Amino acid sequence: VCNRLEQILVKTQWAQSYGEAENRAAFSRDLFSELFNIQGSSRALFSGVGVDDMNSAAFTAHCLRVTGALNRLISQLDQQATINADLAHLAGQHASRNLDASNFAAMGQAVMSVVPTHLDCFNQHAWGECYERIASGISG
Amino acid sequence: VCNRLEQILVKTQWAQSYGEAENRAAFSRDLFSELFNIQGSSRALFSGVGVDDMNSAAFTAHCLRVTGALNRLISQLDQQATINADLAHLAGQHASRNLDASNFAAMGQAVMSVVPTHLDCFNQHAWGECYERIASGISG
Amino acid sequence: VCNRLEQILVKTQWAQSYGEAENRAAFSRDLFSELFNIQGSSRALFSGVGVDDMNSAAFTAHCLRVTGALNRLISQLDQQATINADLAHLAGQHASRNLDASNFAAMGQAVMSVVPTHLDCFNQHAWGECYERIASGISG
Amino acid sequence: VCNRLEQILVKTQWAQSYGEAENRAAFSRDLFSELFNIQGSSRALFSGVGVDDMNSAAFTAHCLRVTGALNRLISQLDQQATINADLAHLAGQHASRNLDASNFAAMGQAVMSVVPTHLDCFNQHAWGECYERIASGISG
Amino acid sequence: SSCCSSEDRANVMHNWDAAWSAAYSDRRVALAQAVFASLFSRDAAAQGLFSGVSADNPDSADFRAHCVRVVNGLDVAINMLNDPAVLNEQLAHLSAQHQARAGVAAAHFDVMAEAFAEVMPQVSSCFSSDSWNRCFARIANGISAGL
Amino acid sequence: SSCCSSEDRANVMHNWDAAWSAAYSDRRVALAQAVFASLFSRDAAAQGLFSGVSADNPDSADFRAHCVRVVNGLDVAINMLNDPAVLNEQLAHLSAQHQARAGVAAAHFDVMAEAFAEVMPQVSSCFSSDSWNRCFARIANGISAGL
Amino acid sequence: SSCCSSEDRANVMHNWDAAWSAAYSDRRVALAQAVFASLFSRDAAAQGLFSGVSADNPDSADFRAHCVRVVNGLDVAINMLNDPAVLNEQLAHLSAQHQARAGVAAAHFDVMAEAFAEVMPQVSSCFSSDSWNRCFARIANGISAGL
Amino acid sequence: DCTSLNRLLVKRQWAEAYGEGTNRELLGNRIWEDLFANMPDARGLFSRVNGNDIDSSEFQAHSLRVLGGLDMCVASLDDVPVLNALLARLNSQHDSRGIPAAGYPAFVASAISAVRATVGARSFDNDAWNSCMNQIVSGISG
Amino acid sequence: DCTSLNRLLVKRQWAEAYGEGTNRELLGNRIWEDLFANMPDARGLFSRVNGNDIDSSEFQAHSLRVLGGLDMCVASLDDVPVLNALLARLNSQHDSRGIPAAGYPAFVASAISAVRATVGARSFDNDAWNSCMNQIVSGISG
Amino acid sequence: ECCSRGDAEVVISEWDQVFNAAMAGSSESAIGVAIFDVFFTSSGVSPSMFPGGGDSSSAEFLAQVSRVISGADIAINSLTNRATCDSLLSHLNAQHKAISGVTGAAVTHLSEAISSVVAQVLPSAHIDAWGYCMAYIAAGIGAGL
Amino acid sequence: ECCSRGDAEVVISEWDQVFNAAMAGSSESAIGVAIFDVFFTSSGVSPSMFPGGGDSSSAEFLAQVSRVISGADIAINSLTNRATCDSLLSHLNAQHKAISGVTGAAVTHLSEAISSVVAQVLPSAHIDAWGYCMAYIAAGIGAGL
Numbered sequence A, B, C, D: 001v002c003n004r005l006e007q008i009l010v011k012t013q014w015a016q017s018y019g020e021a022e023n024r025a026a027f028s029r030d031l032f033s034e035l036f037n038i039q040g041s042s043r044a045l046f047s048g049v050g051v052d053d054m055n056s057a058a059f060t061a062h063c064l065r066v067t068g069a070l071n072r073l074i075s076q077l078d079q080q081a082t083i084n085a086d087l088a089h090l091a092g093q094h095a096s097r098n099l100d101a102s103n104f105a106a107m108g109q110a111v112m113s114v115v116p117t118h119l120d121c122f123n124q125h126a127w128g129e130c131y132e133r134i135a136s137g138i139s140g
Numbered sequence E, F, G: 001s002s003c004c005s006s007e008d009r010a011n012v013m014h015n016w017d018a019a020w021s022a023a024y025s026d027r028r029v030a031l032a033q034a035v036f037a038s039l040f041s042r043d044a045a046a047q048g049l050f051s052g053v054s055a056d057n058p059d060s061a062d063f064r065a066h067c068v069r070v071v072n073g074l075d076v077a078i079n080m081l082n083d084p085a086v087l088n089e090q091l092a093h094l095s096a097q098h099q100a101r102a103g104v105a106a107a108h109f110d111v112m113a114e115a116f117a118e119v120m121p122q123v124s125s126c127f128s129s130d131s132w133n134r135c136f137a138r139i140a141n142g143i144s145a146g147l
Numbered sequence H, I: 001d002c003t004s005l006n007r008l009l010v011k012r013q014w015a016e017a018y019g020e021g022t023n024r025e026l027l028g029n030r031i032w033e034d035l036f037a038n039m040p041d042a043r044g045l046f047s048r049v050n051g052n053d054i055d056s057s058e059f060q061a062h063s064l065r066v067l068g069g070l071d072m073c074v075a076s077l078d079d080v081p082v083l084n085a086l087l088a089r090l091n092s093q094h095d096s097r098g099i100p101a102a103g104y105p106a107f108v109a110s111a112i113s114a115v116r117a118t119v120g121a122r123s124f125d126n127d128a129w130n131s132c133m134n135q136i137v138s139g140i141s142g
Numbered sequence J, K: 001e002c003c004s005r006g007d008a009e010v011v012i013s014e015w016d017q018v019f020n021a022a023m024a025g026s027s028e029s030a031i032g033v034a035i036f037d038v039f040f041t042s043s044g045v046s047p048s049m050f051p052g053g054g055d056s057s058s059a060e061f062l063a064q065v066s067r068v069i070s071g072a073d074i075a076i077n078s079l080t081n082r083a084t085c086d087s088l089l090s091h092l093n094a095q096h097k098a099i100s101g102v103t104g105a106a107v108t109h110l111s112e113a114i115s116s117v118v119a120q121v122l123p124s125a126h127i128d129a130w131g132y133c134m135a136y137i138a139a140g141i142g143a144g145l
């Protein structure tokens, strides 16, 4: 489950899918847009970050922080003790936000929804295991 | 789970992803190629259909039959009693092929791998539920 | 030999090969250039029409008169009594120019040389018979 | 008649006209198509090589053998004793095929028909003499 | 307060017609029924306003035709977004029809929005729910204006 | 047995109209006369079927108009190759007309093909006789079907 | 003696319509008045030919409408340069109308040219006065032919 | 009622439809073909200019003359003192020809149909075109 | 009067409008839709070829047959001995069908309108087309 | 050739304009059931030969209809690759040799029932190309039958 | 200039749309004979001056017609090259100085007979460009006559 081989695969495909500059901004907005279309109750959780207008800077800044947190978590996939400490940090931040396992289940299905549409090659099996790695560390 | 609304969504995205003419042939080959890369033991199950050369007509014909069976199963998603009869037919054909649930689990993860790479919009949540519909009917 | 059917064929292919405007001028110059390259003695016969410079207006005007005479002779191929009168006219003009049969043989081989290079379809059999029609009338 | 100078000229223009790969196949088919349009009786002589469908592999293979035989005969134009031996070989093969001089006359007029349409420069005088060289050696 | 922009309505119109086109079958009834199924589930009082169109039996042809008739009215207004001079007339037309129906308040169109906000992501492929909210308001405000 | 393909008929239609166009003069009579001159020369019995159109005098206007009338009938069917739903009607029309002419057998259309197979290479510029045979059969079989 | 070429008339027609278009206001009167103001200033006798259109008071609507009516007649002929088969009819029409006006000689159209030669450079943006002279002559000669 | 804003709208769309060069013959062809299709006894009024053949050069010079006069009037919609002086001259060139008074509304209908067919039907202001075209023909007829 | 120059002009513009392939059905659609719009009792004359539905394959084969005959005649305008022999055969294929004599000028008007609509109205020679089309139909009718 | 690349290309385009998974299942079955009505009439093959017995309300026959049409759909979409297409038809032929009562004439009837129905639901169809390609498809399925 | 490149370009296109060797000889002679009828009427030059005597059935006059029209055709197609065109007209002028009865006015008549006939056989003709270029052609052939 998300072994040394699969981490390389996932880190690679996340790179070209995430992109650079504003391609990260449209990517990040597509992720939460698909998150809401998969779970409508999730949209209210982001009332503090300008979810009224998903193109607003307030909400785009939140999306880039979440995808950027994903970006740094993907980077340290091959450093087990480093991502464990970072997942432990993120877990304490989400602990008071009244989230359940389906919220992280809707997020992953949004990740599986958006990421491959910017790719020619995608391995959902490796992405499923490696996401469960991150989600279980953040969910608790 | 794969309600009348989600069936429309899945039928739509399967159309532009599957394509026409030879785009179905490359699509079908990408599916089994990703099926083998996700589960190496699956490749031996297709020794009777020229899996030695995956570009051969013998193996391409098998891939188009499997994706074409998917194509006709997707078409009758909104006709519950029709796809039930067709899934029942396919189930009896695979019953003697010594397949387990992980074989259909590797197939779905290959479906989730290939399909979105030919799309701009993909909803893995609806595709997950609607595939489990088909797989459970074929697996038994 | 140059029957009603072949005359249509030759008139057609002469049209797109000859062209219009300056394409007739380059065509006409290519014809005499190939005439001289096929028979070097022929070049001296045109000392009165600026053959010193084959791009000069004096020599180009002579070439267009000769290809234009060909143009009008091709046009009346299907009017036997008309081209006979016109060939009879041209024959009297060349009678005093000290030309032999090889001069008209070199001209035809220049016609067979240039004309098809501006075509996708060429029937040298019909062109051979229909040229012998014109040459025999002009040579005498 | 087809001296050392003219052989170079003919070998050169045959090269760019004949072409490579499939351009030889369309060229070879155009030659026999024009051969039949010039002499309708010639088509029956090729009943053994799939002349029913001129795009068939059976007839295309025959056309490439005939144009390839032309290709090798053109190559040894400047080796008089070599092409004499090769023409002598080809002559014995055609001796029993009930061909007359007009069959080789229709072939040459098909050669003069097709070849220049793939050229910008063509010298029918040199091609006439150098073809008569080959035809007389094959006809006998 | 939110502006249905030129880019907004162009996105909604294409996505909407892609699912609601007449070239397809079985779609319109399944979507329009789910919209009203969500509507009554968010305000059970609203169902009583449809006793004339057999609301107590949704699978009745009398009610399914009401759902198609109502949602295809939205399709008419959606495809008018590229002609707001015509859209304003149509919205005033729908407004006066709803003003003459006892018990139809403006807060109902707030609940009708939630119904479409739930159904459309399940059925529409490239659904941008952010553009949908602003342009649905542009339309729903035109009808609800008055009641 | 041979299929007049989409590429086949597109090649024939362009080459045919290039020679048979109404914008030109003297062409149609010379071609159509040569077709029948070849036809009677391959089956001298066929000439007797045209006693009503003055077959014993080819240069008569009564016979030249027959040759134009017949070959322009082929022009009508050739330009229908891009509409075989219409071509089938036209071919059945020509078939019933020939069924009602005593002495017109199917083997005659085999000889008529040879007539066009001889005339067309002499008159058509870019004549692909291989495409002509398959699409002429597609047409001639439609008329000869029945007799 | 000078040929209004295809390039000439294409240049004049575009420049002329750019200033004389009906989409603009106040232009036509100011231009057409300046043309006649220059005309009478180069031949004071010419003014007497316009006593019927109130020539002694230029700002009168009776005279300003004459200037627009006359110059818009040139606009009609200018835009006919791409159809000289129609232009010849129009010029013969204007010629017979001027032949039936006592005191209109050919030398007047020479003076009318000078009037346009003065006004147009002041008002036209990309004015090529060389093309204007040749094509104005092409038109003015058609009207002046006869008188 | 031909308001001042109607005049700007009519002047612009007229210029766009009228156009330059041979485009004006396309607009004229639309008008006369529609007029003669509805009012066929009007074609006889143009027997002097070969009305039986509208594609003749004689009639086309007449058509462009007519469209030029209409263009002359449309351009002067915002200059009414000059507009009235123009229409008065146009009226003198039409009386004693026996033009049926019903031919003027028919011409208006065909001309509006041609401009509308040229510039596009959507948003087309029939209120502004009818009202300002009526102001033109009413000064010419009667 | 169908002069020899009219024949070259008619032959060229006919070929341009007639065209190749399915273009001929576009010209036929113009002719029949215009004929039946003016002379609606003529549609009954074609009840055998499904005249009520001109878009049917049965009627389209009839339309292209008619246009082929007209093409056959236009191509022979400069070969009058053959032209008369053609029209005589065409006349035999129309009498005893009860075709109203007024239907032939109506067909001429619709056919000229279609060619004119296809090749363009500007410069169109109605004098040459009417005179040479009349020479064709007058040999077919009566 | 019989069913050239041009023939194959246009048949695929028109067929997939009429048949795809984005359409409703009722629309898919309506075409397939109509194709079988044409086949039953032209071939005289017993509807009892099929599951559901030709009952267009039997979910078994509707599913049996889907498998037959999907087979032709796979073959049609592979017409641009005669190498792959001959392999697909060879699989169907060995599948139908094991079935009693399947003859090459009946296959030609059912293959022709596809062309006539496509031309009804799409009158702009290229019926000649539909004839040559479906004859090539039928010659494979009914080879030896 | 008189007959610019634009004038020359469109005159050539329209002329070669009406005159080329792909057309029948009867069509070619019908235009040339019609041109001579216009010339004979407008110039008053005796038809007996030409071989066949203006008899449009005399094969001599039909061939004589062909040489005159082909001369204008060579000149028209060289209008885009005033250098080459002036040389062609200079050859025709020296050819016509040797002929008695040829005047510059008659040449202008025959040159204008070409424009009027082209406009009859092609009503879309650019008659102004046809006027300027044919006047330039006539000024060469009839120079000094």
Ligand code: HEM
Residues within 6 Å of the ligand: A042, A045, A046, A047, A048, A049, A065, A066, A069, A070, A073, A090, A093, A094, A097, A099, A103, A104, A107, A134, A135, A138
């Ligand atoms: C699965 C991987 C996830 C990652 C890497 C992640 C990361 C982050 C980050 C970096 C922030 C920014 C905190 C700050 O800068 O103050 C944040 C905030 C937040 N996240 Fe997540 N998160 C994840 C999952 C989720 C999910 C699934 C949900 C809800 C369904 C969620 C709900 C929130 C909320 C409500 C906030 C605060 C918004 C506010 O301030 O109003 N998180 N997250």
Ligand code: HEM
Residues within 6 Å of the ligand: B042, B045, B046, B047, B048, B049, B065, B066, B069, B070, B073, B090, B093, B094, B097, B099, B103, B104, B107, B134, B135, B138, J091
């Ligand atoms: C999940 C959806 C599936 C569909 C729609 C499907 C459909 C089909 C179809 C149509 C055939 C052709 C049978 C014939 O024409 O004779 C086939 C054959 C076969 N399938 Fe599947 N199948 C599915 C799942 C699977 C999976 C997951 C596996 C293995 C991991 C599998 C293994 C096979 C094998 C071994 C054959 C026979 C190959 C041979 O003949 O040698 N199937 N299937």
Ligand code: HEM
Residues within 6 Å of the ligand: C042, C045, C046, C047, C048, C049, C065, C066, C069, C070, C073, C090, C093, C094, C097, C099, C103, C104, C107, C134, C135, C138, K091
């Ligand atoms: C075979 C078709 C031929 C045609 C249609 C043709 C036609 C003509 C024409 C129209 C002229 C112009 C005479 C004039 O305008 O005064 C001319 C001149 C001439 N041609 Fe030909 N000719 C042909 C063959 C030949 C050949 C084969 C030769 C020589 C090998 C030749 C040698 C000449 C010469 C020497 C002149 C006069 C040049 C001078 O004035 O200095 N002709 N010909």
Ligand code: HEM
Residues within 6 Å of the ligand: D042, D045, D046, D047, D048, D049, D065, D066, D069, D070, D073, D090, D093, D094, D097, D099, D103, D104, D107, D134, D135, D138
């Ligand atoms: C003029 C140069 C020619 C060359 C270089 C040439 C060369 C060849 C060659 C290489 C073959 C293949 C023999 C084999 O591989 O078994 C062949 C076969 C044949 N050639 Fe020619 N040939 C020529 C002229 C002709 C002509 C003019 C004709 C008929 C008009 C002709 C009729 C045949 C026939 C009938 C065959 C045998 C076809 C069969 O097997 O059914 N050849 N020739």
Ligand code: HEM
Residues within 6 Å of the ligand: E046, E049, E050, E052, E053, E066, E069, E070, E071, E072, E073, E074, E094, E097, E098, E101, E104, E108, E109, E112, E139, E140, E143
């Ligand atoms: C965008 C939102 C809406 C649109 C476009 C819309 C449009 C329509 C349309 C097209 C009809 C057709 C019935 C007819 O005219 O005969 C209708 C009727 C009706 N509408 Fe609406 N409507 C909307 C929202 C609502 C809401 C939120 C309510 C109440 C909660 C409502 C209550 C009704 C009722 C009671 C009827 C008549 C029922 C009957 O036919 O017996 N509408 N509306």
Ligand code: HEM
Residues within 6 Å of the ligand: F046, F049, F050, F052, F053, F066, F069, F070, F071, F072, F073, F074, F094, F097, F098, F101, F104, F108, F109, F112, F139, F140, F143, I089
């Ligand atoms: C592609 C082949 C053919 C086509 C398109 C064709 C078409 C036509 C046409 C258009 C006519 C017009 C006469 C009319 O309808 O009034 C006609 C008449 C006729 N055809 Fe054919 N035909 C073909 C082959 C043949 C052949 C091979 C024969 C006999 C050997 C034949 C025998 C006749 C006869 C006898 C007539 C009537 C003669 C008469 O008018 O007195 N046709 N055909």
Ligand code: HEM
Residues within 6 Å of the ligand: G046, G049, G050, G052, G053, G066, G069, G070, G071, G072, G073, G074, G094, G097, G098, G101, G104, G108, G109, G112, G139, G140, G143, H089
């Ligand atoms: C390109 C030059 C000219 C053009 C296009 C032109 C055109 C016109 C037009 C359109 C009218 C309209 C009046 C009507 O028909 O009711 C007119 C009238 C008239 N023109 Fe000209 N004109 C030109 C030059 C001249 C010149 C140079 C003179 C005299 C010096 C002149 C004298 C007149 C007179 C006296 C009238 C009638 C005045 C009246 O209406 O009472 N024109 N002309």
Ligand code: HEM
Residues within 6 Å of the ligand: H042, H045, H046, H047, H048, H049, H065, H066, H067, H068, H069, H070, H090, H093, H094, H097, H099, H100, H103, H104, H107, H136, H137, H140
């Ligand atoms: C806005 C509407 C109209 C305008 C601007 C207009 C303008 C003109 C103009 C400028 C002329 C040229 C006079 C000349 O130079 O001889 C003319 C002529 C003529 N117009 Fe009008 N006209 C209009 C309406 C009509 C209508 C509706 C009719 C008939 C129903 C008509 C019938 C005529 C006639 C018979 C002529 C004279 C024909 C001839 O000269 O042979 N006009 N018109």
Ligand code: HEM
Residues within 6 Å of the ligand: I042, I045, I046, I047, I048, I049, I065, I066, I067, I068, I069, I070, I090, I093, I094, I097, I099, I100, I103, I104, I107, I136, I137, I140
């Ligand atoms: C230039 C004018 C016309 C030409 C060239 C022409 C030519 C033709 C041709 C070639 C046919 C096919 C005959 C056959 O194969 O059965 C035909 C049929 C027919 N035409 Fe004409 N026609 C002309 C005018 C008209 C007009 C004006 C009418 C009626 C107002 C008319 C009525 C018919 C009818 C009733 C048929 C037979 C319909 C049937 O077969 O069921 N034709 N015509």
Ligand code: HEM
Residues within 6 Å of the ligand: B089, J045, J049, J050, J051, J067, J068, J069, J070, J071, J072, J092, J095, J096, J099, J101, J102, J103, J106, J107, J108, J110, J111, J138, J141
């Ligand atoms: C284009 C023509 C045809 C095609 C594409 C076709 C294809 C197929 C396919 C794909 C199946 C199902 C394979 C499976 O169960 O996995 C099938 C089954 C069947 N076919 Fe055909 N077939 C054709 C013609 C025919 C004809 C003409 C007949 C009878 C006269 C026939 C009789 C049957 C029967 C009885 C079955 C049931 C087999 C079963 O349920 O296991 N088929 N066919």
Ligand code: HEM
Residues within 6 Å of the ligand: C089, K045, K049, K050, K051, K067, K068, K069, K070, K071, K072, K092, K095, K096, K099, K101, K102, K103, K106, K107, K108, K110, K111, K138, K141
């Ligand atoms: C555009 C106007 C003209 C052109 C292009 C032209 C050109 C020609 C040409 C090319 C020839 C034959 C040269 C040859 O025999 O090789 C010729 C001959 C002749 N031309 Fe002209 N010409 C024109 C005007 C005229 C005029 C206006 C007349 C009399 C008034 C005239 C009288 C003759 C005569 C009598 C011949 C006979 C010479 C002979 O047969 O040898 N031509 N012309």
